[PDB]
Amino acid sequence: MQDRVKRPINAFIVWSRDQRRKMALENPRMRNSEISKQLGYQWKMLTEAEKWPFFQEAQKLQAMHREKYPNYKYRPRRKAKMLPK
């Protein structure tokens, strides 16, 4: 059995996992797809100083993830792309 490692989540999911639950408790009738749209709208309204703390914590998650797999590399699946010249 092989255990695959998942990439660290950025400052938006960290913020959205906590903010998503609150929006579901206060808006139990709102669907996640509509909440996602409202969260993106509210997140773009946050100031750099307000987002800084969320940037610092996500970076800690990235370092803690790095401490678990310091030699990890992000390797995305690119689409068969061959451009003629």
Add this chain to the structure above:
DNA sequence: CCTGCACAAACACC
């Protein structure tokens, strides 16, 4: 140096 694609998680509805 600049631009574009891939990939992460959570919940309601059928």
Add this chain to the structure above:
DNA sequence: GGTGTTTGTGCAGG
């Protein structure tokens, strides 16, 4: 279970 939705981060190509 699969679908539909969001932003941030990293790597590849020209």
